[PDB]
Amino acid sequence: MASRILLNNGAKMPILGLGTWKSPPGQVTEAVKVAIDVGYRHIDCAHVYQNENEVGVAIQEKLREQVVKREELFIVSKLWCTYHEKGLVKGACQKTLSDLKLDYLDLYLIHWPTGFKPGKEFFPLDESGNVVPSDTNILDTWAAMEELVDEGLVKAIGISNFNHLQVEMILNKPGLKYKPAVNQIECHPYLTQEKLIQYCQSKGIVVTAYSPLGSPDRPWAKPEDPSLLEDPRIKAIAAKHNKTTAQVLIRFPMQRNLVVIPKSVTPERIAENFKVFDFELSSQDMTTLLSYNRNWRVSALLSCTSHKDYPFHEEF
Numbered sequence: 001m002a003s004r005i006l007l008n009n010g011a012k013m014p015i016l017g018l019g020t021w022k023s024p025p026g027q028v029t030e031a032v033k034v035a036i037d038v039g040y041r042h043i044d045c046a047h048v049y050q051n052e053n054e055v056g057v058a059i060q061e062k063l064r065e066q067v068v069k070r071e072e073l074f075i076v077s078k079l080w081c082t083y084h085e086k087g088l089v090k091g092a093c094q095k096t097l098s099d100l101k102l103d104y105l106d107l108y109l110i111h112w113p114t115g116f117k118p119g120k121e122f123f124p125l126d127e128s129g130n131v132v133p134s135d136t137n138i139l140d141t142w143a144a145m146e147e148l149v150d151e152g153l154v155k156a157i158g159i160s161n162f163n164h165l166q167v168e169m170i171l172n173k174p175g176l177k178y179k180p181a182v183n184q185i186e187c188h189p190y191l192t193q194e195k196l197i198q199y200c201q202s203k204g205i206v207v208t209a210y211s212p213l214g215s216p217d218r219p220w221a222k223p224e225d226p227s228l229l230e231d232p233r234i235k236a237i238a239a240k241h242n243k244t245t246a247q248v249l250i251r252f253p254m255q256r257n258l259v260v261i262p263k264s265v266t267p268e269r270i271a272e273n274f275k276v277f278d279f280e281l282s283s284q285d286m287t288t289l290l291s292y293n294r295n296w297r298v299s300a301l302l303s304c305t306s307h308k309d310y311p312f313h314e315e316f
């Protein structure tokens with residue numbers, strides 16, 4: 001198991017990163033410091049997580065302590081939906097760079113394919129509860145992202161929550177300058193993503209698996225929802241390998257040549273989640289975990305099902 005994967009920009013990306021969505025501002029600085037101490041070299045961030053300043057403080061402390069050099073870190077962030085207008089993309093990136101206290105990002109993603117009306121509200125809604133769209137499209141927003149690479153603000157650009165038709169639109173864009181490096185998508189045993197992974201990997205696009213533990217802290221969880229960490233079938237596979245259910249869920253995508261970004265703010269779990277290079281799931285284990293697929297998404301952007309660019313009407 002190589003600890004990094006080669007991107008189509010020539011850079012290497014660590015296959016394990018720390019997620020930061022729902023990491024409260026007062027706890028994320030310690031989380032990132034512990035992660036870097038433990039050995040994490042990849043942090044997944046976003047403007048919309050409202051904690052990038054605190055992530056920046058942690059990275060800076062570790063650079064000053066000389067625990068790591070900047071070139072050893074792989075820092076990812078994402079353009080929020082209210083900044084898809086071509087003229088707003090650079091300013092949004094630079095706000096992220098300022099909060100993170102960085103000269104550049106290793107990777108900058110279009111967070112969702114759906115552009116929203118600009119403003120301070122992250123989700124500008126109509127009276128029916130549906131998001132108010134912006135007059136934007138995927139290709140124009142991509143062109144603006146490419147300019148960030150040209151000016152050296154980011155080393156790579158990619159996408160998140162794009163379906164294969166949306167990826168294909170970018171790959172076929174007239175005058176394309178940079179292919180997406182990464183498509184970051186929800187992926188775990190209940191949403192195995194076989195067709196989209198096959199597609200992306202066939203095009204040389206690296207897939208990052210988000211919510212690998214099933215996002216048990218998501219604010220909208222309902223009692224009827226299935227729970228990966230509580231699934232006795234996955235607990236049994238963990239028992240067999242003398243590992244935790246979380247460790248099995250992290251190793252699973254690694255063996256599919258995916259990058260994976262489990263989130264924690266608990267120091268003990270941050271350390272536990274990194275101890276996944278000392279075992280291997282069997283061929284049968286992988287087939288078994290894949291068989292648990294039930295097309296179940298924790299992250300379905302339900303306020304946007306009538307948006308022109310809603311990604312999840314398509315099969316994949």
Ligand SMILES: NC(=O)c1ccc[n+]([C@@H]2O[C@H](COP(=O)([O-])OP(=O)(O)OC[C@H]3O[C@@H](n4cnc5c(N)ncnc54)[C@H](OP(=O)(O)O)[C@@H]3O)[C@@H](O)[C@H]2O)c1
Binds near residue numbers: 161215216272
């Ligand atoms: N591109 C996108 O649209 C998108 C969408 C969703 C997520 N993401 C990214 O992917 C990351 C991961 O997804 P996620 O945050 O939804 O959820 P996740 O990583 O699947 O699960 C996080 C939850 O699991 C708990 N946990 C972590 N390690 C554990 C362990 N070893 N044992 C027991 N519980 C454990 C955490 O608790 P504590 O933190 O309290 O320890 C938290 O409640 C995000 O943080 C974000 O960076 C991106």
